[PDB]
């Protein structure tokens, strides 16, 4: 059940959430004790999953997991996440939150991942380990 202490939060768009949730759920089930959150359960139909209120993120969640993808920017949902992710706190541009995507964005990028730690499938064939990089970066302590 929704505990009091969390690891990170998941900021994705309803354009390609299925893919994100797949990565997240696969990241939490890892060996290390990882606890990720999301916007809600309505986005993830089927069975109960790991979710949390957006108000408990800056209070409970320590880090954030942003998903900057073409189909994510085309929506306003990212615009809100940006203004909140860009102008969050004085010194948390890429220290707690980290952008990710299943491919390069053919359109413009938001003032969020201008050039920060971004995880894109450039060569998953070998870069596939990226799953561990984010899994270990979300639950380092």
- CATH number at 90 reads 3.40.50.10140
Q: Residue 19: CB partners within 8 Å, gap ≥ 6?
A: 102
Q: How far apart are CA 97 and CA 92, in angstroms?
A: 7
Partnered with residue 37 across adjacent β-strands are 9
Phi-psi region of 58 (alpha: psi -120 to 50; beta: other; left: phi over 0): alpha
Q: How far apart are CA 53 and CA 38, in angstroms?
A: 8
Are 127 and 102 in contact, with CB atoms under 8 Å apart? Answer: no
- Phi, psi angle pair for 54, to nearest 5°: -65, -15
Q: How far apart are CA 104 and CA 41, in angstroms?
A: 27
Where in the sequence is the domain holding 78, given as residue range(s)? 5-140
Which helix (H) or strand (E) segment holds residue 135: the answer is: helix 130-138
Please give the method by which this entry was determined: NMR
Which tokens sit at 41?
A: 């359960």
Q: Name which of 56, 58, 54, 51 is nearest 35 in CA terms.
A: 51
Are 85 and 116 in contact, with CB atoms under 8 Å apart? Answer: no
């Amino acid at each position: 059940h929704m505990p009091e202490r969390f690891d990170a939060f998941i900021c994705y768009c309803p354009s390609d959430i299925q893919f994100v949730q797949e990565m997240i759920r696969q990241l939490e089930q890892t060996n290390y004790r990882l606890k990720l959150c999301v916007s809600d359960r309505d986005v993830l139909p089927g069975t109960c999953v790991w979710s949390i209120a957006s108000e408990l993120i800056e209070k409970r969640c320590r880090r954030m997991v942003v998903v900057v993808s073409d189909d994510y920017l085309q929506s306003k949902e990212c615009d809100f996440q940006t203004k909140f992710a860009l102008s969050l706190s004085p010194g948390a541009h890429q220290k707690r939150l980290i952008p990710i995507k299943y491919k390069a964005m053919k359109k413009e990028f938001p003032s969020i991942l201008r050039f920060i730690t971004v995880c894109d499938y450039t060569n998953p064939c070998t870069k596939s380990w990226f799953w561990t990089r984010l899994a270990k970066a979300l639950s380092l302590p």
